[PDB]
Amino acid sequence: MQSINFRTARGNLSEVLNNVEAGEEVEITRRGREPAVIVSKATFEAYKKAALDAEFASLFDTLDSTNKELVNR
Protein backbone atom coordinates (compact mmCIF):
# COMPACT_ATOMS: atom_id res chain seq x y z
CA MET A 1 0.00 0.00 0.00
CA GLN A 2 1.64 3.19 -1.25
CA SER A 3 2.30 5.63 1.59
CA ILE A 4 2.03 9.25 0.41
CA ASN A 5 2.76 12.61 2.09
CA PHE A 6 0.15 15.28 2.88
CA ARG A 7 1.23 17.49 -0.04
CA THR A 8 1.34 14.73 -2.66
CA ALA A 9 -2.11 13.62 -1.51
CA ARG A 10 -3.59 17.15 -1.47
CA GLY A 11 -1.83 18.18 -4.70
CA ASN A 12 -2.64 15.03 -6.71
CA LEU A 13 -6.01 13.85 -5.30
CA SER A 14 -8.08 13.07 -8.44
CA GLU A 15 -5.10 10.98 -9.58
CA VAL A 16 -5.13 9.23 -6.20
CA LEU A 17 -8.87 8.54 -6.58
CA ASN A 18 -7.97 7.16 -10.03
CA ASN A 19 -5.47 4.62 -8.64
CA VAL A 20 -7.78 3.72 -5.75
CA GLU A 21 -10.67 2.68 -7.96
CA ALA A 22 -8.25 0.43 -9.76
CA GLY A 23 -8.21 -1.45 -6.46
CA GLU A 24 -5.12 0.10 -4.87
CA GLU A 25 -5.47 1.28 -1.26
CA VAL A 26 -3.33 4.35 -0.44
CA GLU A 27 -2.16 5.46 3.03
CA ILE A 28 -1.75 9.22 3.52
CA THR A 29 0.60 10.38 6.30
CA ARG A 30 0.73 13.59 8.36
CA ARG A 31 3.73 14.80 10.43
CA GLY A 32 3.00 14.36 14.13
CA ARG A 33 -0.17 12.65 12.88
CA GLU A 34 -1.75 9.21 13.06
CA PRO A 35 -2.06 7.82 9.55
CA ALA A 36 -5.18 7.44 7.42
CA VAL A 37 -5.78 5.36 4.29
CA ILE A 38 -8.09 5.28 1.30
CA VAL A 39 -9.54 2.84 -1.18
CA SER A 40 -12.87 2.21 -2.92
CA LYS A 41 -16.02 2.39 -0.80
CA ALA A 42 -16.38 -1.16 -2.15
CA THR A 43 -13.10 -2.37 -0.60
CA PHE A 44 -13.74 -0.34 2.57
CA GLU A 45 -17.34 -1.51 2.82
CA ALA A 46 -16.26 -5.08 2.04
CA TYR A 47 -13.85 -5.17 5.01
CA LYS A 48 -16.20 -3.41 7.44
CA LYS A 49 -19.18 -5.38 6.22
CA ALA A 50 -17.01 -8.47 6.75
CA ALA A 51 -16.03 -7.49 10.31
CA LEU A 52 -19.48 -6.37 11.56
CA ASP A 53 -21.20 -9.39 10.00
CA ALA A 54 -18.96 -11.61 12.12
CA GLU A 55 -19.27 -9.45 15.24
CA PHE A 56 -23.08 -9.59 14.95
CA ALA A 57 -23.24 -13.21 13.73
CA SER A 58 -21.60 -14.47 16.91
CA LEU A 59 -23.66 -12.06 18.99
CA PHE A 60 -26.70 -13.74 17.49
CA ASP A 61 -25.25 -17.21 18.13
CA THR A 62 -24.85 -16.33 21.82
CA LEU A 63 -28.39 -14.96 22.03
CA ASP A 64 -30.02 -17.23 19.47
CA SER A 65 -32.60 -18.56 21.94
CA THR A 66 -33.81 -15.15 23.15
CA ASN A 67 -33.62 -13.69 19.64
CA LYS A 68 -36.06 -16.39 18.47
CA GLU A 69 -38.32 -16.03 21.52
CA LEU A 70 -38.51 -12.23 21.21
CA VAL A 71 -39.93 -12.67 17.70
CA ASN A 72 -43.06 -13.93 19.46
CA ARG A 73 -43.01 -11.40 22.32
Partner: protein, 124 residues
Protein backbone atom coordinates in the same frame (compact mmCIF):
# COMPACT_ATOMS: atom_id res chain seq x y z
CA UNK B 1 -16.06 3.38 26.48
CA UNK B 2 -16.90 2.08 23.02
CA UNK B 3 -20.31 3.00 21.72
CA UNK B 4 -22.70 1.72 19.06
CA UNK B 5 -23.13 4.21 16.23
CA UNK B 6 -26.55 4.83 14.65
CA UNK B 7 -25.16 3.20 11.50
CA UNK B 8 -24.06 0.11 13.43
CA UNK B 9 -27.54 -0.11 14.98
CA UNK B 10 -29.08 -0.09 11.51
CA UNK B 11 -26.69 -2.84 10.45
CA UNK B 12 -27.21 -4.87 13.64
CA UNK B 13 -30.93 -4.65 12.92
CA UNK B 14 -30.67 -5.52 9.23
CA UNK B 15 -28.65 -8.66 9.96
CA UNK B 16 -31.19 -9.67 12.62
CA UNK B 17 -34.09 -8.96 10.26
CA UNK B 18 -32.53 -11.28 7.67
CA UNK B 19 -31.47 -14.01 10.11
CA UNK B 20 -34.62 -14.16 12.24
CA UNK B 21 -37.16 -12.40 10.05
CA UNK B 22 -39.51 -9.43 10.25
CA UNK B 23 -40.57 -6.38 8.24
CA UNK B 24 -37.53 -4.38 7.00
CA UNK B 25 -36.50 -0.72 7.22
CA UNK B 26 -36.74 2.25 9.58
CA UNK B 27 -40.03 3.69 10.73
CA UNK B 28 -38.83 7.15 9.68
CA UNK B 29 -35.81 8.52 7.77
CA UNK B 30 -32.87 9.22 10.09
CA UNK B 31 -34.61 7.97 13.29
CA UNK B 32 -31.64 5.80 14.35
CA UNK B 33 -29.32 8.81 14.36
CA UNK B 34 -32.03 10.73 16.22
CA UNK B 35 -32.45 8.15 19.01
CA UNK B 36 -28.94 6.72 19.36
CA UNK B 37 -27.39 10.17 18.98
CA UNK B 38 -29.64 11.21 21.87
CA UNK B 39 -28.66 8.09 23.82
CA UNK B 40 -24.97 9.05 23.57
CA UNK B 41 -25.70 12.72 24.32
CA UNK B 42 -27.68 11.64 27.40
CA UNK B 43 -24.66 9.63 28.51
CA UNK B 44 -22.31 12.57 27.88
CA UNK B 45 -24.73 15.13 29.35
CA UNK B 46 -25.51 13.15 32.53
CA UNK B 47 -21.95 11.82 32.61
CA UNK B 48 -22.95 8.18 32.87
CA UNK B 49 -19.88 5.98 33.49
CA UNK B 50 -21.36 2.74 34.79
CA UNK B 51 -21.35 0.37 31.84
CA UNK B 52 -24.59 -1.26 32.95
CA UNK B 53 -26.48 2.05 33.23
CA UNK B 54 -25.23 2.95 29.75
CA UNK B 55 -26.18 -0.47 28.34
CA UNK B 56 -29.68 -0.21 29.86
CA UNK B 57 -30.05 3.22 28.25
CA UNK B 58 -29.41 1.61 24.86
CA UNK B 59 -31.80 -1.16 25.71
CA UNK B 60 -34.64 1.11 26.85
CA UNK B 61 -34.27 3.77 24.14
CA UNK B 62 -34.37 1.13 21.41
CA UNK B 63 -37.04 -1.10 22.96
CA UNK B 64 -39.43 1.85 23.17
CA UNK B 65 -38.12 4.19 20.42
CA UNK B 66 -39.65 2.35 17.49
CA UNK B 67 -36.68 3.22 15.28
CA UNK B 68 -37.46 0.31 12.99
CA UNK B 69 -40.65 -1.05 11.45
CA UNK B 70 -39.81 -4.38 13.12
CA UNK B 71 -37.22 -6.12 15.32
CA UNK B 72 -37.05 -3.20 17.79
CA UNK B 73 -37.01 -5.48 20.85
CA UNK B 74 -34.39 -7.82 19.35
CA UNK B 75 -32.20 -4.88 18.28
CA UNK B 76 -32.54 -3.38 21.81
CA UNK B 77 -31.33 -6.47 23.64
CA UNK B 78 -28.57 -7.16 21.09
CA UNK B 79 -27.29 -3.57 21.01
CA UNK B 80 -27.28 -3.41 24.82
CA UNK B 81 -25.22 -6.62 25.17
CA UNK B 82 -23.02 -5.86 22.17
CA UNK B 83 -22.22 -2.66 24.07
CA UNK B 84 -21.07 -4.59 27.15
CA UNK B 85 -19.09 -7.14 25.14
CA UNK B 86 -17.35 -4.30 23.28
CA UNK B 87 -16.40 -2.81 26.65
CA UNK B 88 -14.83 -5.93 28.16
CA UNK B 89 -17.90 -7.43 29.81
CA UNK B 90 -18.66 -11.03 28.87
CA UNK B 91 -22.28 -11.81 28.01
CA UNK B 92 -24.34 -14.98 27.63
CA UNK B 93 -28.00 -15.78 26.91
CA UNK B 94 -30.41 -16.02 29.86
CA UNK B 95 -34.09 -16.93 30.56
CA UNK B 96 -34.60 -13.41 31.97
CA UNK B 97 -33.56 -11.53 28.83
CA UNK B 98 -36.91 -11.86 27.06
CA UNK B 99 -39.07 -10.64 30.00
CA UNK B 100 -36.52 -7.97 30.81
CA UNK B 101 -36.58 -6.76 27.20
CA UNK B 102 -40.39 -6.88 27.01
CA UNK B 103 -40.62 -4.93 30.29
CA UNK B 104 -38.21 -2.31 29.02
CA UNK B 105 -40.29 -2.03 25.83
CA UNK B 106 -43.63 -1.63 27.62
CA UNK B 107 -42.22 0.92 30.08
CA UNK B 108 -42.81 -1.30 33.12
CA UNK B 109 -39.09 -1.69 33.95
CA UNK B 110 -37.04 1.52 34.25
CA UNK B 111 -33.47 2.00 32.96
CA UNK B 112 -31.86 1.75 36.40
CA UNK B 113 -33.83 -1.43 37.07
CA UNK B 114 -32.79 -2.86 33.68
CA UNK B 115 -29.24 -1.93 34.64
CA UNK B 116 -29.50 -3.74 37.99
CA UNK B 117 -30.51 -7.02 36.38
CA UNK B 118 -27.65 -6.64 33.89
CA UNK B 119 -25.27 -5.82 36.76
CA UNK B 120 -26.30 -9.09 38.40
CA UNK B 121 -26.24 -11.14 35.21
CA UNK B 122 -22.86 -9.94 33.93
CA UNK B 123 -21.41 -7.78 36.73
CA UNK B 124 -18.27 -8.57 38.74
Amino acid sequence: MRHISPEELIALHDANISRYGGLPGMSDPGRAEAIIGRVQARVAYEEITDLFEVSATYLVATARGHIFNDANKRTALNSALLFLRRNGVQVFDSPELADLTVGAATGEISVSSVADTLRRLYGS
